[PDB]
């Protein structure tokens, strides 16, 4: 028999969130290649890649699991 | 026999969001390639890619598993 | 026998959103090839791709997962 | 006798007048009441009212009062 | 014998005027009663109310009063 | 006899005016009241009220007043 209960809260009451600022690769990025040779697989990323801003106005996370065997 | 209860609350009240500025990649990428010899696969990626500006009013999160075997 | 129970709450009351500014690859991306080999299969992206804003007035994500064997 | 005199100029040379934002109650005002008794009056205000937005291009005032007896 | 004399300027020379933002009320009001008695008049004023934004090119103000008697 | 008189000048040069902003109540106004009794007058207040963004491009402000008797 198995019979967890939960009454759980997870909150928040944030005021007020702002005036965030995120510049990545604000400068200059230069490359330059010659007579390379290559034998196998390239993967090349030049510049600004993949940067995230993220603002959740919540952003609570609650994260559970059960199990028998 | 398999009763788990939830009653669970996951919450925000954010009173305001806002001025949220992401700039990413701004400057110069400069990319100068001679004479190269490239014998498999070539993934090249050049500038600003896949940036993510996420703002969401809530995104709070809630996430559950449950299993028999 | 299996009876899961869920009464739970996932909530937002964000009060106002904005201002979001997102503005990836603002610079210059300059690319010179010259007497190059490529035997291979090329993926080349140059520019700005796959930039994302998601600004939901919600985005609140309850996910669940429930198996017998 | 009575004889006063004016001459005054009342004046601006305002070269241009905009980009005026007023957003009064942007956000949720929510009232939940149970059970009162009220025994007299009720003058009762909810929401977004009597806000005022006053962008003349001149707005001067010149205003004078003269009395005998 | 009464003679008095005004030869005044009242002036203002601005160049331009704006980007003016006004705001009032952008996060929650939250009211909850329950099981009041009033035996008496109520006023009662709830959310964004009575807010200004006034913004006149010249807005100069020249008063004056005079008597005998 | 009375012969004032007045040569006055009031004046401003503002260049430009700008930039403002007045954001009162971004945030939450919670208000939560059980078993209150009033036996008189209730005047009442909630949120973001009588709030003033004044703005004059000029704004200068000449008083006088005069009297005999």
Same mark, same amino acid.
């Given at each position: 028999?198995?019979? %967890?209960?939960?009454? *759980?809260?997870? =909150? *928040?009451?944030?005021?007020?969130?702002?005036?965030?600022?995120?510049? %990545?690769?604000?400068?200059?990025?230069?490359?330059?290649?010659?007579?390379?040779?290559?034998?196998?697989?390239?993967? *090349?990323?030049?510049?600004?890649?993949?940067?995230? =801003?993220?603002? %959740?106005?919540?952003?609570?996370?609650?994260?559970? =699991?059960?199990?028998? =065997?």
């Amino acid at each position: 028999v198995y019979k %967890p209960v939960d009454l *759980s809260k997870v =909150t *928040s009451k944030c005021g007020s969130l702002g005036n965030i600022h995120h510049k %990545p690769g604000g400068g200059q990025v230069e490359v330059k290649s010659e007579k390379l040779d290559f034998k196998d697989r390239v993967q *090349s990323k030049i510049g600004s890649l993949d940067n995230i =801003t993220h603002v %959740p106005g919540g952003g609570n996370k609650k994260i559970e =699991t059960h199990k028998l =065997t």
